[PDB]
Amino acid sequence: SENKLKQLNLNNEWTPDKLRQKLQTNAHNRLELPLIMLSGLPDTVFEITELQSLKLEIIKNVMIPATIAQLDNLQELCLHQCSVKIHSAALSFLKENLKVLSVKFDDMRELPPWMYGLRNLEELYLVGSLSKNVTLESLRDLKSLKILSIKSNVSKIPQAVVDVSSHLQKMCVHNDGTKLVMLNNLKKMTNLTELELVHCDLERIPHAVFSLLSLQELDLKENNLKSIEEIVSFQHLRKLTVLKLWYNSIAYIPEHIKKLTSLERLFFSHNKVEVLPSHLFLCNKIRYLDLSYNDIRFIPPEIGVLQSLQYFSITCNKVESLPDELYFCKKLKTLKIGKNSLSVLSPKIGNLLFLSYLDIKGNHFEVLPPELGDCRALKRAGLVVEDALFETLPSDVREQMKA
């Protein structure tokens, strides 16, 4: 008797107007309705047929009724610290329709056991503790799973993921620093194209990565990497274009990196690099190069050979001079000089006709070159500088950049 009146007072309060007031567009380009502290699920929720995602936060003892079948445009479900039970027809609807799922559990209490039966699920995001052996059930009935992201404290890639190896394409594990010591199952992730082993305390590039011949992107963030001479084995991965070694302790970029033929995006920010060698710029197909938060002092002239370079960042280094050959990278779209030790800015920056973002705040400039007006895509909103330095620009250069 009390439960009926409870839901009556939830449905009375949450009318479709006040519910649609909370409608927004989420990070996955979907129309989402966020519920944050309710006593349950209002039945009126199933009248908002236009919503594409349903986000539940801190709602304990939730039951999804069969009226969930009314949400004809339902592709995503989000659970933050929620204990959710489903109806039979509700689970059938979610099995045939739910495509993206994101669950955050403080305890195993909030990880729904029905999630393992959603075959039409394409993306799965878990943020919670799953550990010896992972307490993840076999992803056996996720027949269409493509992206898996596990945020945990896990020491081994669970065998549960080996049951999705035939069609899984992107796997992300961002552990809390717990060392991933058993990497054997990663060898069975054949059809993987993007891999993220972040903050796993690996300490060396793992051998298993060299088994993913179809791998294109790689993220090894926050793993205390000091020696990366295993880059040699990456020439066995002939389709690798994105290689992220950022947030490590690397001080020496070996010559073997020049043999990474298909390299285009190189993430080397937040390392211990003091000298960037000549051969680093023999990877002529590089578009993205972030070397920020290092001890770089000189930029080599050979960077001029990177004719396809569009993104370059050396913020928070010890750079004292920039080579003029840098302004041969005529496709430069973003230049982040940032907090260095530059005394003068070359007029040849006018050659970068595509430059749209420049950050030179925190340097040793005395006057800015007028040829900054030749960068037709660069605006003051996209130009980071000391306002006193921006005053050194010619008057109409100033106005043309502001309007």
Residue numbers in the entry: 396 to 526, 531 to 802
Copy text from the publication.
Volume-regulated anion channels (VRACs) participate in the cellular response to osmotic swelling. These membrane proteins consist of heteromeric assemblies of LRRC8 subunits, whose compositions determine permeation properties. VRACs are composed of proteins belonging to the conserved LRRC8 family, whose expression is restricted to chordates. This family contains five members in humans, termed LRRC8A–E. All of them share a close sequence relationship and consist of an N-terminal pore domain (PD) followed by a cytoplasmic leucine-rich repeat domain (LRRD).
Its structure determined by X-ray crystallography at 3.1 Å shows features similar to those of the A domain, with both horseshoe-shaped proteins superimposing with a root-mean-square deviation (r.m.s.d.) of 1.4 Å.
